[model samples]
Target: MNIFEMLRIDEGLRLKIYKDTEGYYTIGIGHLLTKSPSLNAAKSELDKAIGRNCNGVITKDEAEKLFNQDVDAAVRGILRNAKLKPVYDSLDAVRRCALINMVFQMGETGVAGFTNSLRMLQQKRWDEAAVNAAKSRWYNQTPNRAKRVITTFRTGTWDAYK
Candidate 1:
C-alpha cells in the first residue's frame, strides 16, 4: 500500500542480490541488473530502461519509486477477484501482507487458485490454512518463502526473512 510496506513485501525488508524471473541479475527490491554491452544499440536500450552504469545497485529511494510503479498494478490486479475481496479485507495486516505477497508472486488468479487454503483461512483454521498453503506448486517451487508465509498464517506474526 505504501513504500515501507511494499519494501517488506518485495525485498523482505532487506537489500538483496538475486536473479529475477527473466534471469537478469537483480538487486534492491527487484531492480533489474543494469549492464550495457558495447553494442551501442543494446547499450542505448539499457540506458533507456535503467540508465547506464547503474551497476545493479539502487538506493532505497530508487527502490521505493520502482515499488510504487509496480504496487498499483498489483493492487488493481489482485482486487479484481470479487470472491477473494471480502476474505482479503477481513484479514489482519500481517496476513493481508502475506496474501499480497502471494498475489505478487502468483498473480490474483493463481492465488485464488488456492481455494482450499483460502477457505481454511476464511474459517480461521490456522493449521489447515498453513497446511493448504504449503500444498501448492508455488510452495514446492519456493519452499523457504512459503514457510515464511505459512508461518505468518499459523502465528499472525511478521517473522519472514528475519
Candidate 2:
C-alpha cells in the first residue's frame, strides 16, 4: 500500500482543505489542523504494539513529528517481513522507499497483488514498473500522488515530490 492510497482509504481524497468527521480542519491526505493527546493515545497504542512514545496538545509541527515517527516504524515493519525482504532489498534505496510507502498505504498484502509491477521491479525494468503502477485503480484515483511515486520508481529519485 502507498501512503496516498492509505489516505484514500482512511480519509478519502481531498485536493483542498476540508472538515473531517471530527470537524478538525484537515488537508493533504488527512493531515489534521491540530494534535491532541487523545490522538496521541491511539497512536501510542499502535506504538506499544510496535514499541514506541509521545506527549500532549502539541503544535502542528509536533503533530507531524508523531506521524513521522509512526511512519518510520511502519517502514521498518515492511523491512521485517521475510517474504518481502528479498524483492524489497533488490531495489535501490529510492524505489525501496517508494515500495515501503506503498506498503504503508496498502498493507503488505495489498502491495503483493501488484504481481506484474513487482516482477518488473525485480527485473529492474523501471519504466515498465512505473507503467504498471500507473495502471492501477490507485493511480486512477490519485493521479497526483501516484505520479509522484511512479516518477520516483522510474528514476530512482527519492525526492519524488518537489
Candidate 3:
C-alpha cells in the first residue's frame, strides 16, 4: 500500500513537525519507517518491486496493487533475508503488519540490517527488541515517530492509533 494506506496515516499524521520546511513532502509516521533487507547480485530481482510498470508513477489501481504486493513482499522478503531464521512457525498479524510496513520504506536491503533485532524477534525477544529498537540510528533520527512504531513492534498492540 502507499504510505497513507499502509500506516493508516491521515490528516493527523500529515502534520508538519517543522514549519518552513523547504523541499519537504508531507508524510506520515509510516512513511518514515524502514527495514534493511539484503540483495543478491547473482540473482535476478530486477523487476521485483520497482515503481508502476504501466507508467513511471503509480496510478490509483497501481497504488492499490503495488501496496498489497508491498505488504506481501515485506513479510516474504524478511523471512527470506533475515540473518537468524525465525523459530516460530509463523508471525502474528500485528508483527506481519509491522514488518510489511517496514519493507514499504526501507526496501528489501533496508530490512536486512536489523540482524540483532531480527534475531531477538525470531527468538521472541520482545523486551530486548523494544529496548534495542529505541537505540537504533533510525530510532534516534526520528524519536517521536520511531517511538510509536517501536512500541507497536514490542507490544504488538495498535495503541499508537488508539
Q: Of 1 and 3, which scores higher on TM-score? A: 1
Comparing 1 with 2 on TM-score, the higher-scoring candidate is: 1
Between which residue pairs do clashes occur in model 1?
Answer: none
Better of 1 and 2 by lDDT: 1
Q: 33-135 in candidate 1: lDDT tens per residue?
A: 4443333433344345555454434457666666665566666776778867777777887777778777766668888888888888888898989987787
1-162, model 2: which lDDT tens digit per residue?
A: 445333344444443335555454443345454344355444454344333342212344444454565567657776787667777889886677678767755667778888888888889998989887888888887677678778878998645554
- State TM-scores per candidate: 0.69, 0.61, 0.58
lDDT of each: 0.65, 0.63, 0.50
* Model 3: ten consecutive residues of lowest lDDT: 34-43
Q: Which wins on TM-score, candidate 2 or candidate 3?
A: 2
Which structure is stronger by lDDT: 1 or 3? 1
